[PDB]
Design a protein around this ligand. Structure first.
Ligand code: HEM
Ligand code: HEM
Lengths: 110, 114
């Protein structure tokens, strides 16, 4: 399908998480933004991509959205692997497929 | 299997054109942005989605980029006015990507209201 290439080669960083909040897709644009190689992210928890000072609050943000269920775009401060931070814009989408709830975040430098 | 749904249900409008500049994918978000139902766009030249006063010049920019061979698209980087079916205008932000697949060059535009 042309849809995989469309996201894989996208100029926007793309991060897809499964029902268990594990990262299942992390494109090259995302690698550049975070400073992580997909090999260090795929299969691991979304928690590793969340800024350290937000790790305490982010889990509940996701949990609450999953149970009781959307899309929104706003600027967020991203923390890279090396600790440096950059402002970006996130376009978050809730994706329902085959009875499961996934989330795709499309990211752009800001 | 999840890549299609991820774009189909995306909050961002998505427009995919093939090697002949014809629209092969136009999601619901794009329907809302432009005011066209996807069935009205599929198979047509991207020209119908371009503001009327820009239609004469836009084709050459796509052609030039295709002939260029560069991986990243640098243009359409700032806020642009999108013309809806009813003729009204709305400010938007485009994220243009050149997609190489099947030995062909496609373009995917991700759009949001700005
Ligand atoms: C640089 C990394 C990230 C930061 C700083 C961040 C920050 C936040 C913040 C502050 C919220 C609270 C809602 C609001 O914006 O007011 C939130 C909610 C959320 N985030 Fe993230 N996030 C990041 C990455 C991700 C990723 C990669 C995913 C998954 C693909 C994700 C999924 C969600 C979900 C599902 C919610 C709940 C949305 C809702 O309330 O409807 N986030 N995030
Ligand atoms: C609201 C509709 C649209 C408007 C107003 C618009 C406007 C423009 C303008 C003014 C340029 C030339 C200046 C620049 O590079 O910034 C341009 C270039 C271009 N546009 Fe569009 N466009 C629209 C939709 C699209 C769509 C749907 C596609 C394809 C999926 C597309 C693909 C391109 C390409 C490939 C270029 C050449 C850019 C480069 O060489 O870097 N445009 N567009």
């Amino acid at each position: 399908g042309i849809f995989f290439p469309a996201l894989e080669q996208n100029m926007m960083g793309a991060v897809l998480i499964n029902e268990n909040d594990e990262v299942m897709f992390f494109n090259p644009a995302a690698e550049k933004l975070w400073g992580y190689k997909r090999e260090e992210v795929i299969g691991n928890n979304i928690d590793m991509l969340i800024p350290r000072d937000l790790r305490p609050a982010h889990p509940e943000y996701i949990r609450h959205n999953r149970e009781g269920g959307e899309g929104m775009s706003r600027e967020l401060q991203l923390e890279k692997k090396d600790g440096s931070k950059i402002w970006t814009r996130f376009a978050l989408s809730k994706v329902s497929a085959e009875g499961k709830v996934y989330y795709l975040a499309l990211v752009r430098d800001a």
